[PDB]
Structures are given as structure tokens and as C-alpha cells.
Amino acid sequence: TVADKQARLMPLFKHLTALTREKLPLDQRDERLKGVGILPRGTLFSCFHARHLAEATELYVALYGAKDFNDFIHLCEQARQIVNEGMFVYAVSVAVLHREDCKGITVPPIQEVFPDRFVPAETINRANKEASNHPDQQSIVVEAEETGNILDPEYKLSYFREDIGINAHHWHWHIVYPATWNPTVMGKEKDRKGELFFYMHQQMCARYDSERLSNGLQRMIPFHNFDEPLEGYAPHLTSLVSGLQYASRPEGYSIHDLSDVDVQDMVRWRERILDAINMHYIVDKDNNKIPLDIEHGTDILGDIIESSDESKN
Amino acid sequence: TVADKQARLMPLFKHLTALTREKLPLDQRDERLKGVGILPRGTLFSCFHARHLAEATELYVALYGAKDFNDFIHLCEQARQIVNEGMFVYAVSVAVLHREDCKGITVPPIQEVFPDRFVPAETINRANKEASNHPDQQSIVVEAEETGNILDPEYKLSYFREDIGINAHHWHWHIVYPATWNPTVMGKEKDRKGELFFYMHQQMCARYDSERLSNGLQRMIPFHNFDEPLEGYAPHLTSLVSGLQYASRPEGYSIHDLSDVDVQDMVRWRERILDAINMHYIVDKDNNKIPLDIEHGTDILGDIIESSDESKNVEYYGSLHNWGHVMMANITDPDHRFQENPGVMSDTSTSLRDPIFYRWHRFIDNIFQEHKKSFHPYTKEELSFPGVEVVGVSINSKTANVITTLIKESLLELSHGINFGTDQSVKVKYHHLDHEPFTYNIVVENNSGAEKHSTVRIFLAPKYDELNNKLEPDEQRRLFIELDKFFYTLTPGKNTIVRNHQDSSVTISKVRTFDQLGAGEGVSEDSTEYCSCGWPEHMLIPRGSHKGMEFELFVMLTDHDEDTVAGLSENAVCSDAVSYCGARDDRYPDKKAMGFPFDRKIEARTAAEFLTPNMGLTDIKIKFHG
């Protein structure tokens, strides 16, 4: 039944952390993932980075490709063991969302799956500590609220920024509209995904601005200039998977090139995208021009800007 | 042939009520018969009362004494004419069960023989009425379920208490282990009957408690104080035999002296027993003291408490348990001036229905518990089976780790029991609790180099208390019910043992109806226990609730080499139901104390702490379907 199906899915989600370690007498046994899972857990999975997205897409396709639900579970059983866990959650969630066979099925809570992302390290530490401190069946409750010398007024916004629901939503939205989404492979297409990309993010900003004003703060200003140094933020989040946490960013940093991309390559892209806007057309790979039609224009721009697989160039 | 033999036995059982009218010119010819015939026919027979038991024993002996099966049929045929019918059924069933000549033979259904005990007054009446109302060959069907206003919550338990299978089992068990049993006369002895007496009754109470909790009711309290008034219960049972029925008991009456026994004496026997526990010895008739040994102690106590013929001292210790049934049964007319029939407590078939049964049995169980208390707890050494580790257990059903329970309709055929007349069959429809089939999968790691043999023991205990969720193992001991016990061999490395609920050692796989028996099947041919005894299958797990009540599922593996006894007994015989019934003409197949590991006090606050490596607890849910 559906209920049984739900039950099977929940365990795909349990202990994402611990289900690493190959557990495979001949480690070739998921050849489909000898290629994908070139991310071992070391760094974190990036939703944004292209290479990471490529692996993720490869994973989803296998899940989509699965002939039946049972086959789907089997892939998700054996494969999870190799691939980076973050990528895995990402690929599976996409599969659950789209794949018909999954006409059954919620995904386990993101907050619940990775509590460490939602709550501060201190609270997480305390809970873990209490668990060890006195063994007992009894329940442990920890109040995350803390006590602290709030210097920054940005702190006021924390109710909005830190909100569990907001973060969860953002995770889910990207899952429904993946950047990697290839309509040919799936066959189905996501209507107006580029435009939606634009709208959803715009709303988040708009809503954010209303908070600042409620706060008595001025509206946020764009990162127009790449040269400008960024304001620092320390997340105080730990990752339970290994020894590390999200690195904090101290005050005042000017912009540095990564091996993967130069910030100047970036500046070009901004010029280009905005060029085409004025010129009212964009150039396809074919070197044909497509007009930024009133109907189509936002969608085409959304795909290019994000950018999705859909980008015309 | 055996089949012919079966046929002869069934008619011994037919029209018992009618069989009266002696038609005997003189009993003197029947010298064998001289001893019996004191109790009048119509009168109700008491399984508990000593005098009644004495007559019954006398009857059985004659049946045992019968030189051959043919002789057996003859005396039986003749005896049945004079003796009270209830006593007769009792004596015959015992004979059929034990007497070799009867290597052939089921006993006709108790429910079927006396349908009136199983079904309410109303549906007895309706069926009888329909039979008379319109003469016609056509079959009559009556649904026993009724319609009424339920003012007492005890009613909720009725599915358990009233269950046909449960009552039948209780009848049969007493037959396999009669209180009257004299080993010298038979020559054979019933192994650990006293202990079994204790274990079986304890399980009934334990199982009962699980029902109350499933219900959301608190656990039953023991009837410790003789002074307290009893709760009333009206059975609504009629006896087809005469114009009477089991007398009902209204609310709030205290126990009163009977001519036969004073309540005083009840108090005294039970003080005497308590002393003997603590002093660590009991006094025999010889005035010698026998120690309450760890091995022997429960058995000796069981015989004294019940008490059986086996009791080391009847004249001192008395018969507390049995008298309790008698006293409660005739609370309504202790004097018997009223000349009213006794209540349900008087009969093994009926007694489970009254809620008082549990109160009394918990009281007696307490006596055993005090004894158990005197014993030291179990060390890791005793519990553990080294090299074996239990990785996990899973229960497979429609939904894993959830068992579903529902009510099922069933029909009982009255025709063998009551005069049918023209009708081909009169069936009464009743409903009982039932559950979906399920299997267990236990993963065990055998660290040792060689194959091991293990006894798998599975028990179920409620997670929730009346207060909140608290797995306090001491308390759990009372609650734990035995699901299954079986032998399995484990090879080295990982092993998965799968067992199906159907296989359960606690339950009777099937009871053959007088109709099936009318033909001739091949489960094999042993006797009163045959299809009869064993706990009923539908009953295997508690009802649970719609919400899906949480129960602890406990699996333990023990070294079989230690557990089994060696000896040379029979072919595959009535052993399906070993857990509660034992084995035919065999020693109890498990060395461990019945109820192990649960029997002794548990030091730990939580059950989990108790677990050794060869033990495991899996929480499962039982959900009832309305």
C-alpha cells in the first residue's frame, strides 16, 4: 500500500551520515555510481556549483530511470552507501517529487533529517552531551534561545533569517525546480521555471525588506559592485557528519578568484546579460537571436541568469 | 479400526442430559459402580469441591481399570445412566485422554456438547423456540450478539472473558491435569503438574491484564482481603438440563461461611502457606520438613495451593484455591436454603467469564510470587548464551511491525448438545477477536565456529502503564505473555530465523468439530487435549487499540543443549501446544522455569538495561479495526 511505500522511503532518509562506508564486498557493484559520487564527503555538497549539480543530475536520472518503485528503492539502498550524502538527499528528493511510482509520498523532514542545519551548535552539543552524560530513557529538552551580547542590529532580523520554516521552504523550492532539470530526459517540462525562479527570489527579498522596515532599518542595498567588501556573518552551525562546521565570515572582505571561476569572468556575464536586455534579444548557441518577448522574456532571462540547463547559451 | 472407535466414543457423549433415567434394576450387579452415584443427576457438578472431585476420581478409576476398550465402553454406557452427567463427562474425558486403548480418539466438543454454557440464554431460547415454532427440516440460524445498553465498562473485556475458545481450553486443561490425579493408581505421574497449575493460571491472568490495558483499564487487583465485597456479574447462561441457570451475583456482597467451609479456614490455610514459604520448608504428614528447593519448590507449592491429591499435607494446608471457587460460586446462597444453583465460578468451562476469577487468581498468583521472591535473581551467566548475538527482530504483516486485530463472526452448531428435533442444524452466530497472520524474522550472529542449537523464546509486554510510558521490568514480569518457544539450529555467521504465528507453541492449531470427527482425519489420534487444549489462535495477541497500542516484543535465545532433557518417549503427538499444555505422556520439554526469564525479580529500572546479548526488544504496534 501507499503506507508501506511511505515506510520504505523514510528509511532511505535515515542516518544519511552513517550509511557511507561502501558496505559492498566487490565495490564495483554499483557501477552506475563509480562515476557519480566523485564527491566523497570532504567538502560539503553545493547546490550552486556546476560540477556538483552535474553529479546530482546524474543521480536523479538513475532514480527516474528506475523501472519500478521496488527497483527505485534498490538503487536508493545500494547507491546511497557510495555517493556523498548531501547529493543523495538532493537526488532522492527530486526523484520522490517527480516519479509517478512515488504517487504515495512525503519526504522526511529536512529540519528533522538534518537538525544541525536548523539549530545552533550549542544546542546540538548540549543534546548530544546530555545523551551521553546520563544514560536514561528519559527525554532531553534543550532551549535553543541562548543568552548573548547582541552588538549587531542585524541580529534583530534573525527571527526572519533564522526561521526554520523559511530555510526548509527554500530547500524544497529548489527541489521542485532543479537548475539541472533536463526536460528531454524527463520528458516533462517545468512550466515557467525561469520566471518562477525570478518571482520566488524576488518575493524573498521583498519580504525581507518589509522586515527591515518593520525593524526601522533601511531597505537592503544590492551587491552592485563586486569590489566592495562583504559584511561578516557567523552561522554557529556544526555538521554532525564529521568534525566540521560552516566557516564563518569575518567583517570586510574584498573579492577573490576561485580556481573554478574568476570574478572578472563573472563581471563579463553581468555585462552580457544586461546587454541583451537593452538590445532586446539574446543569442542562442546557434548564433540565432531570440527576442525578449513580453510573454517569454522573463522566463528566458531566468534560465540564463540562474542559470539552468535551459539557458539558451 | 480407530475410526470405529471414534464413532463409539461420540455416542457416549450424546444426549447426556437425557441419558439419565437409570433403567437399572440393580447397581449391585455393578460392583464396580458401587462407589459412584452419590451426586444426583440434575445437580450441578463442581470441579472445585472436594466431595465432587472424589466421586469423579472414583469414576475415572473404574474407567482406567477397564480391561479393554470394549469393556470401557460398556461400563461407561452403564455408568452414564446413573451418575450425574457433569461428573460423567469429566470422568470420561479424563479416561479418554489417558487410557492407551483410547490410542484413537478425540472427545466431542465441549462447546458442542454443552452449547448452553457457551451461548446466552436468549439464543438458546430462540433456537429452541424456532425449532418448535415452525416445524421444518430447514436450518435455523441465530445471531448471539444481541442489542443492549452497556453501563458497565467490564463489558468491553467480554470479548476475552466470554470467548468460546478460552473457556474450552480451561475445561480441557483441568482434564489433562486433574486435581484428583493419583499417581499410584494410574502408575504414571504428571510431570510438574503443580508448577504447570501455577504457570497456566498465571498466564491467564497476565493475558487478561494485557486486555485491560489495551482497553485503557488498570490492571486487575488481587482479592487479598476476604472481607471486601465482590463486584457482581450476571452470566445469562441457562442449563438446558433442568429448569435452572447459573445464579447471578449482584454488587457488593462479602464472602460468607458455607456449611462445608468457614472463611476462617481460608484465612488460616493461607497464613499457614505464607509461613512455610518464609520458613523455607513445608511440613509433611509425617511431620518431616521438606525444603522449598529451587528446583522443586514451585511444584510442591502448586500441589498444596490448588490443592491436589499430591499435596504433602492436606489436613494442615487445606485447599485454598478450590475453596475459593466454591465460596464465590455460592455467595448468593451460602446456606443453600434457597436451593439455587451455583454461579459460573463452579465450572471450569464457565469460570473465566466472571471478572472475579481474575481477582482470585491474582491473589493465588501472589502466593507463588512470594515464593519466587525468596529466590535469587539471575546472573548474566544464567541468562547469556555466549557467542550468540541477536542483531534484530522484525515482524512482518501487512504493515511491518504492526499487527492488526479485528472481530470475526463465527457459528457454533448446537445440534449435538441440545435436542434438535426436526431441524438439520441449529447454529448460533457469535463474534470473537482475531488478528492478521504475521511472521517474525530474527537475525542472529553466531560467533562460534560450530553450529549451535538455540531455543527461541518470544514474549509480548505492554509498553504503557496507567500513568505514562514506563518499561519497568519488575512490573513487566506480571504482564509478559508468551508468544512462542521453539528450537532452531544456527550455523556460524549470520542467520535469519523466520517463524510464522500459525506455528505458535502456545496455541491450538485446530479443534475438530463432531462433524469432522464423524469422518476421520489424521492429525493423529491422541485425546481430550487433541484439538481442544492449547490457547485459541485468535487469542494469540491482545486486542490493542485503534490508535495502535505499543507493546514490547521480546526475543531471547538460550542454549538448547542445556534446555532439553534426554529420554525416550513417542512419535509426533500433541506438541503443537507445548507452552501451556506440555507434551503427551512426556516430561516438560524445557529445563528452564516456566516463564523464564521473567519469573525472578529484576533489579533494573528499565527493561532495556536487563538485556543481554542474546536478548532483544522490538517495539511493535497492535491496532484494532472497528
Coordinates of C-alpha atoms in Angstrom, one line a residue, chain B residues 158-550:
Chain B
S158 CA -16.3 -9.6 27.3
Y159 CA -14.6 -10.5 24.0
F160 CA -11.8 -12.0 26.1
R161 CA -13.8 -13.4 29.0
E162 CA -16.7 -14.7 27.1
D163 CA -14.6 -16.2 24.3
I164 CA -15.6 -19.8 23.5
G165 CA -12.1 -21.0 22.8
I166 CA -10.8 -19.7 26.1
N167 CA -13.5 -21.4 28.1
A168 CA -13.0 -24.6 26.3
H169 CA -9.3 -24.6 26.9
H170 CA -9.7 -24.1 30.6
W171 CA -12.0 -27.1 30.7
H172 CA -9.5 -29.2 28.8
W173 CA -6.5 -28.2 30.9
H174 CA -8.1 -29.3 34.1
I175 CA -8.8 -32.6 32.4
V176 CA -5.2 -33.2 31.4
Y177 CA -4.1 -32.3 34.9
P178 CA -6.8 -33.4 37.3
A179 CA -6.5 -32.3 40.9
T180 CA -7.8 -35.7 41.9
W181 CA -5.0 -37.4 40.0
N182 CA -3.4 -40.2 42.0
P183 CA -0.2 -41.3 40.6
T184 CA -0.1 -44.6 42.4
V185 CA -3.4 -45.8 41.0
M186 CA -2.6 -44.8 37.4
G187 CA 1.0 -45.6 37.9
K188 CA 2.0 -42.8 35.7
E189 CA 2.7 -39.3 37.1
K190 CA 2.1 -35.9 35.6
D191 CA 5.4 -34.1 35.4
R192 CA 5.4 -30.8 37.2
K193 CA 1.7 -30.6 37.4
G194 CA 1.8 -28.3 40.4
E195 CA 4.1 -25.9 38.6
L196 CA 2.0 -26.1 35.5
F197 CA -1.0 -25.3 37.6
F198 CA 0.8 -22.2 38.6
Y199 CA 2.0 -21.2 35.2
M200 CA -1.2 -21.7 33.3
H201 CA -3.3 -19.7 35.7
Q202 CA -0.6 -17.0 35.9
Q203 CA -0.7 -16.7 32.1
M204 CA -4.4 -16.4 32.0
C205 CA -4.2 -13.5 34.5
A206 CA -1.3 -12.0 32.6
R207 CA -3.1 -12.2 29.3
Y208 CA -6.2 -10.8 31.0
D209 CA -4.2 -7.8 32.2
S210 CA -3.0 -7.1 28.7
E211 CA -6.6 -6.9 27.6
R212 CA -7.4 -4.4 30.3
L213 CA -4.5 -2.2 29.4
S214 CA -5.4 -2.5 25.7
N215 CA -8.8 -1.3 26.9
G216 CA -7.3 1.6 28.8
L217 CA -8.2 0.0 32.1
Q218 CA -5.9 -0.5 35.0
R219 CA -4.5 -3.9 35.9
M220 CA -6.7 -6.2 38.0
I221 CA -6.2 -6.1 41.7
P222 CA -5.9 -9.2 43.8
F223 CA -8.6 -10.3 46.1
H224 CA -6.3 -10.1 49.1
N225 CA -8.9 -9.3 51.7
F226 CA -11.7 -11.8 52.4
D227 CA -13.8 -9.1 54.0
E228 CA -14.2 -7.0 50.8
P229 CA -17.4 -7.2 48.9
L230 CA -17.4 -8.7 45.4
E231 CA -18.4 -7.0 42.2
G232 CA -21.5 -8.5 40.7
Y233 CA -21.7 -10.5 37.4
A234 CA -24.7 -11.9 35.7
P235 CA -23.8 -14.7 33.3
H236 CA -27.1 -15.1 31.4
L237 CA -26.5 -18.8 31.0
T238 CA -29.2 -21.4 31.2
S239 CA -28.9 -25.0 31.8
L240 CA -30.8 -27.0 29.4
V241 CA -30.8 -29.9 31.9
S242 CA -33.3 -28.8 34.4
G243 CA -35.3 -25.6 34.8
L244 CA -32.3 -23.7 36.2
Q245 CA -29.4 -21.4 35.3
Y246 CA -26.2 -20.2 36.8
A247 CA -27.2 -17.8 39.6
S248 CA -26.2 -14.3 39.0
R249 CA -24.4 -12.3 41.6
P250 CA -25.4 -8.7 42.3
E251 CA -23.0 -6.0 43.5
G252 CA -21.2 -5.6 46.9
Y253 CA -21.6 -8.9 48.9
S254 CA -18.8 -10.2 51.2
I255 CA -17.9 -13.8 51.4
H256 CA -19.9 -16.0 53.8
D257 CA -19.4 -19.2 55.5
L258 CA -20.7 -22.3 53.9
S259 CA -21.6 -25.4 55.7
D260 CA -18.7 -27.1 54.1
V261 CA -16.1 -24.5 55.0
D262 CA -15.7 -21.5 57.0
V263 CA -14.0 -18.4 55.5
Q264 CA -11.9 -18.5 58.8
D265 CA -10.3 -21.7 57.5
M266 CA -9.5 -20.0 54.2
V267 CA -7.6 -17.3 56.0
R268 CA -5.8 -19.9 58.1
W269 CA -4.7 -22.1 55.2
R270 CA -3.3 -19.0 53.5
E271 CA -1.4 -17.8 56.7
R272 CA -0.1 -21.3 57.0
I273 CA 1.2 -21.3 53.4
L274 CA 2.9 -18.0 53.9
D275 CA 4.7 -19.2 56.9
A276 CA 6.0 -22.2 55.1
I277 CA 7.4 -20.1 52.2
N278 CA 9.4 -17.9 54.6
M279 CA 10.5 -20.7 57.0
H280 CA 11.7 -22.2 53.7
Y281 CA 10.1 -25.6 54.3
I282 CA 6.7 -27.2 54.5
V283 CA 5.6 -29.9 56.9
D284 CA 4.7 -33.3 55.6
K285 CA 2.1 -35.5 57.2
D286 CA 5.0 -37.4 58.7
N287 CA 5.8 -34.1 60.3
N288 CA 9.1 -34.1 58.4
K289 CA 10.1 -30.9 56.7
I290 CA 10.7 -30.7 53.1
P291 CA 12.6 -27.9 51.8
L292 CA 11.3 -25.5 49.2
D293 CA 14.1 -26.3 46.9
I294 CA 14.7 -24.1 43.9
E295 CA 14.1 -26.9 41.6
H296 CA 11.1 -28.5 43.4
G297 CA 9.6 -25.5 45.2
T298 CA 7.1 -24.3 42.7
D299 CA 5.7 -27.8 42.1
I300 CA 5.3 -28.6 45.8
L301 CA 3.6 -25.3 46.4
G302 CA 1.3 -25.8 43.4
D303 CA 0.1 -29.1 44.8
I304 CA -0.6 -27.6 48.2
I305 CA -2.2 -24.5 47.0
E306 CA -4.6 -25.9 44.5
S307 CA -4.7 -28.3 46.2
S308 CA -4.1 -31.6 44.5
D309 CA -4.0 -35.1 45.9
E310 CA -0.3 -34.6 45.7
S311 CA -0.3 -32.0 48.5
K312 CA 2.2 -33.0 51.1
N313 CA -0.3 -32.0 53.8
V314 CA -4.0 -31.6 53.1
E315 CA -5.0 -31.6 56.8
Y316 CA -2.9 -28.6 57.7
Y317 CA -2.7 -26.7 54.4
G318 CA -6.2 -27.4 53.1
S319 CA -7.3 -26.5 49.6
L320 CA -7.3 -22.7 49.3
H321 CA -7.7 -22.3 45.6
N322 CA -10.5 -24.7 45.1
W323 CA -12.5 -23.5 48.1
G324 CA -12.2 -20.0 46.7
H325 CA -14.1 -21.1 43.7
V326 CA -16.7 -22.8 45.8
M327 CA -17.2 -19.9 48.2
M328 CA -17.5 -17.4 45.4
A329 CA -19.8 -19.6 43.5
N330 CA -22.4 -19.9 46.2
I331 CA -22.2 -16.4 47.6
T332 CA -25.8 -16.0 46.7
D333 CA -26.9 -18.9 48.8
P334 CA -24.1 -19.9 51.2
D335 CA -26.8 -21.7 53.3
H336 CA -28.3 -23.4 50.2
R337 CA -31.6 -22.8 51.9
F338 CA -32.6 -21.1 48.6
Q339 CA -31.7 -24.2 46.7
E340 CA -30.3 -22.0 43.9
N341 CA -27.7 -23.2 41.5
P342 CA -24.1 -22.0 41.8
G343 CA -22.6 -19.3 39.7
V344 CA -20.1 -19.7 36.8
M345 CA -17.2 -20.0 39.2
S346 CA -18.3 -23.6 39.9
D347 CA -17.3 -24.8 36.4
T348 CA -14.1 -24.9 34.5
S349 CA -15.9 -24.2 31.3
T350 CA -17.7 -21.1 32.6
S351 CA -15.4 -19.6 35.3
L352 CA -13.3 -17.4 33.0
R353 CA -16.3 -15.3 32.1
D354 CA -16.7 -13.9 35.6
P355 CA -14.4 -11.0 36.3
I356 CA -14.0 -12.2 39.9
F357 CA -12.0 -15.1 38.5
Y358 CA -9.0 -12.8 37.8
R359 CA -9.2 -11.2 41.2
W360 CA -9.0 -14.6 43.0
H361 CA -6.3 -15.9 40.6
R362 CA -4.2 -12.9 41.0
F363 CA -4.5 -13.5 44.8
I364 CA -3.2 -17.0 44.4
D365 CA -0.6 -15.9 41.9
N366 CA 0.6 -13.6 44.6
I367 CA 1.3 -16.6 46.8
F368 CA 3.5 -18.1 44.2
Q369 CA 5.2 -14.7 43.7
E370 CA 6.2 -14.5 47.3
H371 CA 7.9 -17.8 46.9
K372 CA 9.6 -16.6 43.7
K373 CA 10.7 -13.6 45.6
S374 CA 12.6 -15.7 48.0
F375 CA 14.8 -16.9 45.1
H376 CA 17.8 -15.0 44.0
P377 CA 17.9 -13.2 40.7
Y378 CA 19.5 -14.3 37.5
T379 CA 23.1 -13.5 36.8
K380 CA 24.4 -12.7 33.4
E381 CA 25.8 -16.2 33.5
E382 CA 22.4 -17.8 33.6
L383 CA 20.8 -15.6 31.0
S384 CA 23.6 -15.3 28.5
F385 CA 24.4 -17.6 25.7
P386 CA 27.8 -16.6 24.6
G387 CA 28.9 -16.2 21.1
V388 CA 25.4 -15.6 20.1
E389 CA 24.2 -12.1 19.4
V390 CA 20.8 -11.0 18.4
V391 CA 21.1 -8.3 15.8
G392 CA 17.4 -7.5 15.3
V393 CA 13.9 -8.7 15.1
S394 CA 11.2 -7.7 12.7
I395 CA 7.6 -8.6 12.5
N396 CA 6.1 -9.0 9.1
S397 CA 2.5 -8.3 8.4
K398 CA 0.6 -6.2 6.0
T399 CA 2.5 -3.3 7.6
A400 CA 5.7 -4.2 9.2
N401 CA 5.8 -4.2 13.0
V402 CA 2.1 -3.6 13.1
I403 CA -0.4 -6.3 13.9
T404 CA -4.0 -5.8 13.0
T405 CA -6.8 -7.1 15.1
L406 CA -10.5 -7.3 14.2
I407 CA -13.7 -9.1 15.1
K408 CA -14.8 -12.1 13.2
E409 CA -18.1 -13.8 13.1
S410 CA -18.4 -17.5 13.7
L411 CA -21.1 -20.1 14.1
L412 CA -21.5 -22.9 16.6
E413 CA -23.6 -25.9 16.0
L414 CA -26.0 -26.7 18.8
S415 CA -27.4 -29.9 17.4
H416 CA -25.1 -32.3 19.1
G417 CA -25.7 -30.7 22.5
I418 CA -29.4 -30.0 22.6
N419 CA -32.4 -31.9 21.2
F420 CA -32.6 -30.9 17.5
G421 CA -35.9 -32.5 16.7
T422 CA -36.7 -31.9 13.0
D423 CA -34.1 -29.3 12.2
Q424 CA -30.9 -30.4 10.4
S425 CA -28.8 -27.9 12.3
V426 CA -29.2 -25.0 14.6
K427 CA -26.3 -22.7 14.6
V428 CA -25.6 -19.8 16.8
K429 CA -23.5 -16.9 15.4
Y430 CA -21.1 -15.2 17.7
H431 CA -18.2 -12.9 17.2
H432 CA -14.6 -13.1 18.5
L433 CA -11.4 -11.2 18.4
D434 CA -8.9 -12.2 15.7
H435 CA -5.7 -10.9 14.2
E436 CA -3.9 -10.9 10.9
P437 CA -1.3 -13.5 10.4
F438 CA 2.3 -12.5 10.8
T439 CA 5.9 -13.8 10.9
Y440 CA 9.0 -13.0 12.8
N441 CA 12.4 -12.6 11.3
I442 CA 15.3 -12.7 13.8
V443 CA 18.8 -12.0 12.7
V444 CA 21.3 -13.8 14.9
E445 CA 25.1 -13.7 14.7
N446 CA 26.8 -17.0 15.6
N447 CA 30.3 -16.0 16.6
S448 CA 31.2 -19.6 17.4
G449 CA 33.0 -21.8 15.0
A450 CA 30.4 -24.6 15.2
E451 CA 26.7 -24.8 14.7
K452 CA 24.7 -24.1 17.8
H453 CA 21.2 -25.1 18.9
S454 CA 19.0 -22.5 20.4
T455 CA 15.6 -22.2 22.0
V456 CA 13.9 -19.1 20.9
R457 CA 11.6 -17.6 23.4
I458 CA 9.3 -14.8 22.5
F459 CA 7.2 -12.7 24.8
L460 CA 5.0 -9.7 24.5
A461 CA 4.6 -7.0 27.2
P462 CA 2.7 -3.7 27.3
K463 CA 4.9 -0.6 26.9
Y464 CA 2.4 1.8 28.6
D465 CA 1.4 1.9 32.2
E466 CA -1.7 3.7 33.6
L467 CA 0.3 6.7 34.5
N468 CA 2.6 7.1 31.5
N469 CA 5.2 5.2 29.3
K470 CA 7.4 3.2 31.8
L471 CA 9.2 0.0 30.9
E472 CA 9.9 -1.1 34.4
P473 CA 10.9 -4.6 34.1
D474 CA 9.9 -5.6 37.6
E475 CA 6.3 -4.7 36.8
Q476 CA 6.6 -6.1 33.3
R477 CA 7.1 -9.6 34.7
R478 CA 3.4 -9.8 35.6
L479 CA 2.3 -8.6 32.2
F480 CA 4.6 -10.6 29.9
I481 CA 2.7 -13.1 27.8
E482 CA 4.3 -16.0 26.0
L483 CA 4.0 -15.9 22.2
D484 CA 6.2 -18.8 21.3
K485 CA 9.0 -21.2 22.1
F486 CA 10.9 -23.3 19.5
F487 CA 14.2 -24.9 18.7
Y488 CA 16.4 -23.7 15.9
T489 CA 19.9 -24.5 14.8
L490 CA 22.3 -21.7 13.9
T491 CA 25.3 -22.0 11.7
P492 CA 28.3 -19.9 12.1
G493 CA 28.0 -16.4 10.6
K494 CA 24.7 -14.5 10.2
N495 CA 21.5 -16.4 10.3
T496 CA 17.9 -15.3 9.8
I497 CA 15.2 -17.3 11.5
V498 CA 11.7 -16.9 10.3
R499 CA 8.7 -18.3 12.2
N500 CA 5.1 -17.9 11.5
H501 CA 2.4 -17.0 14.0
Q502 CA 0.5 -20.1 13.0
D503 CA 3.3 -22.3 14.3
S504 CA 3.0 -20.8 17.8
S505 CA 3.6 -23.3 20.5
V506 CA 1.1 -21.7 22.8
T507 CA -1.9 -22.2 20.6
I508 CA -4.1 -25.0 19.4
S509 CA -3.9 -25.2 15.6
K510 CA -7.4 -26.6 15.2
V511 CA -10.2 -28.2 17.1
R512 CA -12.1 -30.7 15.1
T513 CA -15.9 -30.4 15.1
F514 CA -18.1 -33.5 15.9
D515 CA -18.9 -33.4 12.2
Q516 CA -15.2 -33.6 11.0
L517 CA -14.8 -36.3 13.6
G518 CA -17.8 -38.0 12.1
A519 CA -15.5 -38.8 9.1
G520 CA -11.8 -39.5 10.2
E521 CA -8.7 -37.3 9.9
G522 CA -5.0 -37.7 10.7
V523 CA -3.6 -35.1 12.9
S524 CA -3.1 -38.3 14.6
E525 CA -5.2 -39.8 17.4
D526 CA -4.4 -38.8 21.0
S527 CA -7.3 -37.3 23.2
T528 CA -9.1 -34.6 25.3
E529 CA -6.3 -32.3 24.6
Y530 CA -6.4 -33.1 20.9
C531 CA -8.0 -30.1 19.4
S532 CA -9.4 -28.8 22.5
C533 CA -6.5 -27.7 24.7
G534 CA -3.8 -25.2 23.6
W535 CA -4.6 -21.5 23.8
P536 CA -7.0 -20.4 21.0
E537 CA -5.3 -19.0 17.9
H538 CA -7.5 -15.9 17.5
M539 CA -6.5 -15.0 21.1
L540 CA -2.7 -15.1 20.5
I541 CA -2.3 -11.3 20.8
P542 CA -4.1 -8.7 22.8
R543 CA -6.7 -6.5 21.2
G544 CA -4.7 -3.4 21.3
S545 CA -6.5 -0.2 20.3
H546 CA -7.5 1.6 17.2
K547 CA -4.6 4.0 17.8
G548 CA -2.2 1.1 17.7
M549 CA -1.0 0.4 21.3
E550 CA 2.7 -0.1 21.8

